[PDB]
Amino acid sequence: TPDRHQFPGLANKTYFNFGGQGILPTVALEAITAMYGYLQENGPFSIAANQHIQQLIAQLRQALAETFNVDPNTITITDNVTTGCDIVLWGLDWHQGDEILLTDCEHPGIIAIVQAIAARFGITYRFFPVAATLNQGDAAAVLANHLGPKTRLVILSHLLWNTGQVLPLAEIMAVCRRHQGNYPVRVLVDGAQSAGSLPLDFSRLEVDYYAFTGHAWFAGPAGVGGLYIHGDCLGEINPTYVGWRSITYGAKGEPTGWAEGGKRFEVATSAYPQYAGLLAALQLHQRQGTAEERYQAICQRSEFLWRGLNQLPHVHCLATSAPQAGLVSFTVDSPLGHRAIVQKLEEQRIYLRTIADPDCIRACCHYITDEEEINHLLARLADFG
Amino acid sequence: TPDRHQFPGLANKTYFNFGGQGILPTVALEAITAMYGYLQENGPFSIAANQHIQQLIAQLRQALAETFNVDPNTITITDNVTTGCDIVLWGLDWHQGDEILLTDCEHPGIIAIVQAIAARFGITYRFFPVAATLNQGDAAAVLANHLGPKTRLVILSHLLWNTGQVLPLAEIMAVCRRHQGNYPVRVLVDGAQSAGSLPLDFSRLEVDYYAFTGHAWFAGPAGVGGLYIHGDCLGEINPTYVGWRSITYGAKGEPTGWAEGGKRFEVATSAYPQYAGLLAALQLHQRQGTAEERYQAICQRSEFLWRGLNQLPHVHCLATSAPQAGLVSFTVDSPLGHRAIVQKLEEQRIYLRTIADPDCIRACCHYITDEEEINHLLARLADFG
Numbered sequence A, B: 001t002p003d004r005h006q007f008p009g010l011a012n013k014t015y016f017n018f019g020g021q022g023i024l025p026t027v028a029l030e031a032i033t034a035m036y037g038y039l040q041e042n043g044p045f046s047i048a049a050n051q052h053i054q055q056l057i058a059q060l061r062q063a064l065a066e067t068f069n070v071d072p073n074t075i076t077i078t079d080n081v082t083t084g085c086d087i088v089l090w091g092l093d094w095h096q097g098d099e100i101l102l103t104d105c106e107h108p109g110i111i112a113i114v115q116a117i118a119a120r121f122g123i124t125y126r127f128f129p130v131a132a133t134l135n136q137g138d139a140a141a142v143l144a145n146h147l148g149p150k151t152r153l154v155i156l157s158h159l160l161w162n163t164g165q166v167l168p169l170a171e172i173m174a175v176c177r178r179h180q181g182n183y184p185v186r187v188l189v190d191g192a193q194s195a196g197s198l199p200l201d202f203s204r205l206e207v208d209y210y211a212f213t214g215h216a217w218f219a220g221p222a223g224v225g226g227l228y229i230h231g232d233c234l235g236e237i238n239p240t241y242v243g244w245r246s247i248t249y250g251a252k253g254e255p256t257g258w259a260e261g262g263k264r265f266e267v268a269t270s271a272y273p274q275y276a277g278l279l280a281a282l283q284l285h286q287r288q289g290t291a292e293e294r295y296q297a298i299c300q301r302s303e304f305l306w307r308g309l310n311q312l313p314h315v316h317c318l319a320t321s322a323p324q325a326g327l328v329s330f331t332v333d334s335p336l337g338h339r340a341i342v343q344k345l346e347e348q349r350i351y352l353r354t355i356a357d358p359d360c361i362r363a364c365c366h367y368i369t370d371e372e373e374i375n376h377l378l379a380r381l382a383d384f385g
């Protein structure tokens, strides 16, 4: 039984875009507003304010650490999912000829970093087909058939943003560690959709690097995200974008080394009030139930929506089995085109999004989504054909 | 005649830390709060919201451009001063043996980037003495005596954060362009203190790269800054940290090239509401008078404080002539030590800061600062000896 009242934005609209950005809870806006007030009353720049900011940062780092069941030292605070990927990709000691493998469902922004890396260090990159494994096949086996002697890193999204498939991460990791080549194969995971929807425990689930954001499923404000790096991989990642937050200081205030753990990849002044907003959102989700309970609630909503769409004659879900998470992608048989359809729905205050590849429409159901909203969506979709 | 009422934080304290972070004006907090409301009512992720966000970004880019009298295409929006420096430094095509020259008054965070760059590309770096040129000498001449055949870039703070000196940027640029070596010498300027206090016109003042932030003298919120790159230098800067905001898109949503002008160095999701806050703070300053008028007002206040300190027997200003800007640094003859003195002042709600090198105390006077605040500071300082 979710407390929908904590998310005022739900009230006069039918929202299904949590994957793009979550509806901000009241407690998050209160924390943001309270931080501006604290800074105005006590600083904004002063011993008291600077200490309050450092304490707030430690508190967020700790809440994130607890969310994934890991030590705070493995957590880096960023502004979004992408930055975490930039940190890992630019930090690796690349040699000409090294190879990177990405799935064919990765984000355009991520592909751009890889192209930038290829141009700078002379590495190469290839894609491997996973989109087609939504209803059959094995993504891990596809990867195994693409691994080569020069493969050094694999990049994949845990929950695919376009089709809604949850990749078999554990099996994929095993395939990578089993491989014998010039390098021990490592895996960088884009968790833009998975973090905050799927139950994640990095002490049970072995991962190398995991990038995420707080503004989508975690329902925090735009501008705050994070990155997990396993303690055994920290040494392989050289800091790149650095600043006063990245170092330790000497007698005369001179740089003497890298800050502890993930702090070495943090740069400088950030939007502190927003950090308090994310912290408040994180604590709110825990009061609603465990990650597991919230996950099952999300799946109950997506399946209900999925079933409803299966009944509509001119709508075709991409998944032939129940969604493994909160994402439900589908096409609509109509002369209008998916972008015009999404715009018409928004005109009715029903919010979904268009996907470029494959060309389809995507809806996100969260644990706070209810049956009336789903039925209202189904009702309006019934109009096209 | 400044409208102090627009800056509510001034009221029950005596603030002199504008160089660390400016007091946020009411119109800025209103704009931030209003943006959260707009996102909640119209999205937060949707056609309407996404368009509103893009329009806000263009509006801020344009206001910044007008502030420095340049074309919007030369402006990149970042989170702070440091990021701008990381973009320029990591973007240059460094070759082993290349040399970087920095003043001995640069920020620790900036030095850390340079050290990271030296380790990665095998370049070298050396400092040149400018601190000692506050009351005598010529910083441009010092630089001329250090320039070598392999010198490729010079890094300097336009307004020194530790001593308050305004470097002779025009003369320094001439010296650099006059030099004949293996590379045409370029200059990266750290404008953490100068932007928003000194009148800056990059159409009259020729500069290569100029990094700045909006949270200090411009009085915007923590988290939003920017970077200027001359059109003739854009090509030499390769994008490094990139994301979906850095590229142009193709038919199937794939990367087809770099976004226009400075957009190529912008990454991904940011704290949009804060952008509206900086935009509002920028427009507020323009309503108070021109940059020149505000600069003279700042100097009238700093000289008044400087004169006041010269009268105190146990206080010694670092500058033997009137401050060239709003920064007034000084030492205090006392067994207590400068950090204990700053803490005691804060106990009395008087806000200044300690400087590590040279070991001194620094006060910042803005155009909104008044005589009562300065006299109150002088009164409490009189207590030490």
Ligand SMILES: Cc1ncc(COP(=O)(O)O)c(CNCC(=O)O)c1O
Pocket: A019, A020, A021, A079, A080, A081, A082, A083, A107, A109, A157, A160, A161, A190, A192, A193, A213, A225, A353, B243, B268, B269
């Ligand atoms: C799989 C995946 N990876 C990266 C992003 C970009 O996130 P940002 O926080 O802006 O760095 C996304 C964004 N998805 C929004 C959506 O799917 O609607 C993503 O899905």
Ligand SMILES: Cc1ncc(COP(=O)(O)O)c(CNCC(=O)O)c1O
Pocket: A243, A268, A269, B019, B020, B021, B079, B080, B081, B082, B083, B106, B107, B109, B157, B160, B161, B190, B192, B193, B213, B225, B353
């Ligand atoms: C000269 C100089 N350079 C960089 C910074 C860092 O700015 P950030 O926006 O956090 O990247 C500063 C900060 N100064 C604060 C102060 O002077 O009190 C600086 O001075």
Ligand SMILES: [K+]
Pocket: A309, A310, A311, A312, A313, A314, A315, A316, A317
């Ligand atoms: K159907």
Ligand SMILES: [K+]
Pocket: B309, B310, B311, B312, B313, B314, B315, B316, B317
């Ligand atoms: K004196």
